[PDB]
Each structure stands twice: as C-alpha cells, then as structure tokens.
Write a protein that binds this ligand. Structure first.
Ligand SMILES: [Cu+2]
Ligand SMILES: [Mg+2]
Length: 224
C-alpha cells in the first residue's frame, strides 16, 4: 500500500486502442512521486500517427500517485490496493460524438508501477472534433469526485473534462469510472472526496515520433 509510494517510483504505461476501426498502441515511461502528487511521463504512439488527439487520452494514460494529505490517508483506495493492484474501467462520452470504453490493470511489476490499458472507441463522427483533430494541445484543471462502492469493494468516480476546440469552443468528455481491487487483501473504502489536478502538455523537440510529454500534479481534497 502507501509504503510503496514514499519515494520516486518508475512508471510504465501500455495502451492498445481501436477507435472506429483505427487501431493504435501507445507506450509511456516515466516516474511518480506521490509525496508531491507528481507525475512526469512521455508517451509515444508506437504504431505511427495517433488517430485521436493526445489530450483525449490523458485521463486514460495512475491515481495511486495522488498526494493524499495525512489527515485523509484513510481514504486512499488506490495505494491500499497495491501491490496486487486494481482494475480501472471508464466510459468517456464525448458530447455530440462517440465514446471510449477503457479497461486498465494497474499493479506493480517488480519495483515498476504498470498501467496496462485496452481502449475501444465507437460511434465517432469522421470529421468531428476527435477524429478530425480539432482539439488544442493542452489540458485543463478539474476535479475527480470519488465515492465508495461498497458493493464491489471499490470506488466510483465521475467528472467532466472540457477539451478546448481550436475555434474557441469546448468539447465535453463526461467520465464515468469504476475501480476494483485485483487482490484479496483488504482495501480502504473512502468517504466522498475529490482529486484536483494540474496538467502541462509539451513536446520533445528531439522526438520525431508522434508523442506527448505530460506533467501532472494531483492532490486529494474535500475533507478538512
Ligand atoms: Cu492524468
Ligand atoms: Mg482557444
């Protein structure tokens, strides 16, 4: 659980995706320091051009790195499931467009924290904001509202992401999420609270592959 996260932990992310028949893979590498809620990762589309905008994959591409204040430590489901880990499932509904369904397994492999994801996108509009690549390369501040799901010995979350459209508008992405432990050990089921995130997206000027450099800070809040 928590003791596994007192220092800097290497992270690996592997994603297999199919969006309207457009198949792609992403590999990511980096590290997290949960003491500071800090994530630093670089993602590469190992199959060529990514067929969706990178910002639409940020949420899919390790909430165990959230900074939980000491006074909220009893509410940290995500680290409590480690090292065996948890399954994270979402439906991401893009307003007036298609949806992503994701399934991910997050666990330790040796001293590395691994996020293995399958992503399936359907009902996208061929030159909507997603398949038509009309979204700005940025990602806004928001809140992830978590509640306990005692029935499944896990948690649920809901939240809205607003992606900036190059024309000045916004593309809403409604997120519904469920997490459940993989292992048999006891887990921490939290009182209602939220995660607050700050995200910065950049490019490696020496990288020729389609990629995303991502810096996030994530803090739990909502109980004081
Ligand atoms: Cu994130
Ligand atoms: Mg703008």
């Amino acid at each position: 659980g928590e003791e596994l996260f007192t220092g800097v932990v290497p992270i690996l992310v592997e994603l297999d995706g199919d969006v309207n028949g457009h198949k792609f893979s992403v590999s990511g590498e980096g590290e997290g320091d949960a003491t500071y809620g800090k994530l630093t990762l670089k993602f590469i589309c190992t199959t060529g051009k990514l067929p969706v905008p990178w910002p639409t994959l940020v949420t899919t591409l390790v909430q165990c790195f959230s900074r939980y204040p000491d006074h909220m430590k009893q509410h940290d489901f995500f680290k409590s499931a480690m090292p065996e880990g948890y399954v994270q499932e979402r439906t991401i509904s893009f307003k007036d467009d298609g949806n992503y369904k994701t399934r991910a397994e997050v666990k330790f492999e040796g001293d590395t924290l691994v996020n293995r994801i399958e992503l399936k996108g359907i009902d996208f509009k061929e030159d909507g904001n997603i398949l038509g690549h009309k979204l700005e390369y940025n990602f806004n501040s928001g809140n992830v509202y978590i509640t306990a799901d005692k029935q499944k010995n896990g948690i649920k979350a809901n939240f809205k992401i607003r992606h900036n459209i190059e024309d000045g508008s916004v593309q809403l992405a409604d997120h519904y999420q469920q997490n459940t432990p993989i292992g048999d050990g006891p887990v921490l089921l939290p009182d209602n609270h939220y995660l607050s995130t700050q995200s910065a997206l950049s490019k490696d000027p020496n990288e020729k592959r389609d990629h995303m450099v991502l810096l996030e800070f994530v803090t739990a809040a909502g109980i004081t």
